[PDB]
Structure formats: structure tokens, C-alpha cells
Amino acid sequence: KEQQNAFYEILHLPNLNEEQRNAFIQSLKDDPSQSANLLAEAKKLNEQQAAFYEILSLPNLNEEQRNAFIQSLKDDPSQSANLLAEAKKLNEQQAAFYEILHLPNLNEEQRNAFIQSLKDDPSQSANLLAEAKKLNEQQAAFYEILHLPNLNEEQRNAFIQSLKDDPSQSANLLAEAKKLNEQQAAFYEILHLPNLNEEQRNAFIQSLKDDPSQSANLLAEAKKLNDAQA
């Protein structure tokens, strides 16, 4: 019975070529008593060559690392499991590494120390990248509201205080600030428009100080009137 099982299993080993497969099958033709051996040996070139494929397809390793794993596996065929996992671990460490090293809103202290905590404990890469990205978002937002040109410093340090207290609302505190910014912006450019009479200007100040939701629209209207009354 074992000749049939080993026969089928060798004929359906997915990671061998026809040369290897038919060589093994010819060996089974010579001495069927070597059945449990051949199958074993046979499949131990399977999960070897399969391994050669996977380490060949990990993109965050270099050639030296890859073919170094290939070599270290051709010398120790039975460790293909371990050497693979290790390899598939290293892929993370490097992938995280450069992703941490290419965040444009971190200074050199935060770089060298995130990266140093990566070299020290790679098992936490998944988290060290995460909070890095978070930080790279947060700090970025801090740099945007810090350079919005139409806010008095009370408004700036108010928003900054709010996001410092709660970084989970970052994208909502930024989009708020900009909003106010744009609104106030329009205000300025309405009062510095030369060809309007003070009736339309007072009415615009009132309606704007009521519904900023159409601020942009209002501004546009004003400008067009400014074009017509030149």
C-alpha cells in the first residue's frame, strides 16, 4: 500500500521539476522498499526549493542577504524552516527601518533614537513604526498651524494647546484651524478692496460675521462686484 501513497505524493510534490520528480520516481522503480525513505528525501528537497523561492521574493532585503540565505541553506538543508522565519523576520526590521528613516517631520534625535530602539529590540518594530507615523503626522500638523498667516497668536497657541492635549483629534483640529484661517483671510481682502461703497461693505461684514459657511462664495461675489465697480 505504501508504494501507492508515496507514488501519488511524489507525483504531486509542487516545488520540484520533472527532472527531479522523474528521477525520484525511477528510484522508486528500482527499489520499492526504499519507499518511506525516498518520499522523505523527496519532500525534503521540496520545502528546500520552495524556501529558495520565498527568500528570492522578499523585496526589503539586498542581494548579499538573499543569496547569503540561499548559501546558508544549501549547507544546512534541514534548517530551511528556521532560516526562513529569521529571513522573513529580517524583512520586517529593514522594511520598518528605512520607513522610519524617511519621515520628513522628525529631527535627527528622533531618527537616531527610534532607529536605535529598532536595532536594540526588533520585535517591537511594528509599534515603533506606528507611533512614528503618528508622530510624523502630529508634528506635521503642528508645523502647518504654526505657519497659518491669518491667526492671532492666541488662536495659534489655543489650537496647539488643544492638539498637545489630544493628538487623536489632529486631523480635525488642523482642518478647523485652516477653516478659520481662510475665513479671516477673506475678511482682510474684503476691507482692502478699493472699488466698493461702504453700504455693500457693511452688509458683507455683517452677513459674513453671521454665516462663515459661505465665506469663500461671499469673497468671490465681492471680487466680482469689485470688477464691475472699477
Author numbering: 37 to 266
Paper text:
Here, we propose a method for generating proteins and protein complexes with complicated shapes using fusions of alpha helices. To design amino acid sequences that can stabilize the alpha helical structure of the fusion sites, we superimposed one or two turns of terminal alpha helices of connecting proteins using a molecular graphics program. Then, the amino acid residues important for forming a fused helical structure were chosen from the two natural sequences in the superimposed region. Our method does not require complicated computer calculations for the design process and can be used for the assembly of artificial protein complexes with predictable and rigid structures.
We thought that proteins with alpha helices at both their N- and C-termini might be fused to generate artificial repeat proteins by connecting the C-terminal helix of the repeating unit to the N-terminal helix of the next repeating unit. To test this design strategy, we used a protein A domain as the repeating module and generated 3-, 4- and 5-module repeat proteins. All these repeat proteins were successfully produced in E. coli and could be crystallized. In the crystal structures, all the repeating units were connected as designed. The twist and bending angles of the fused helices were very similar to those of the ideal helix. Interestingly, the protein A modules in the crystal structures, especially the last ones, exhibited significant structural variation, and close structural analysis demonstrated that this structural diversity was due not to the helix fusion but to the intrinsic flexibility of the protein A module. For this analysis, we downloaded many of the protein A structures deposited in the PDB database and aligned them structurally. The analysis showed that the three helices also varied substantially in orientation and position in wild-type protein A structures; this result implies that crystal packing selects one specific conformation of protein A from a mixture of several available structures.
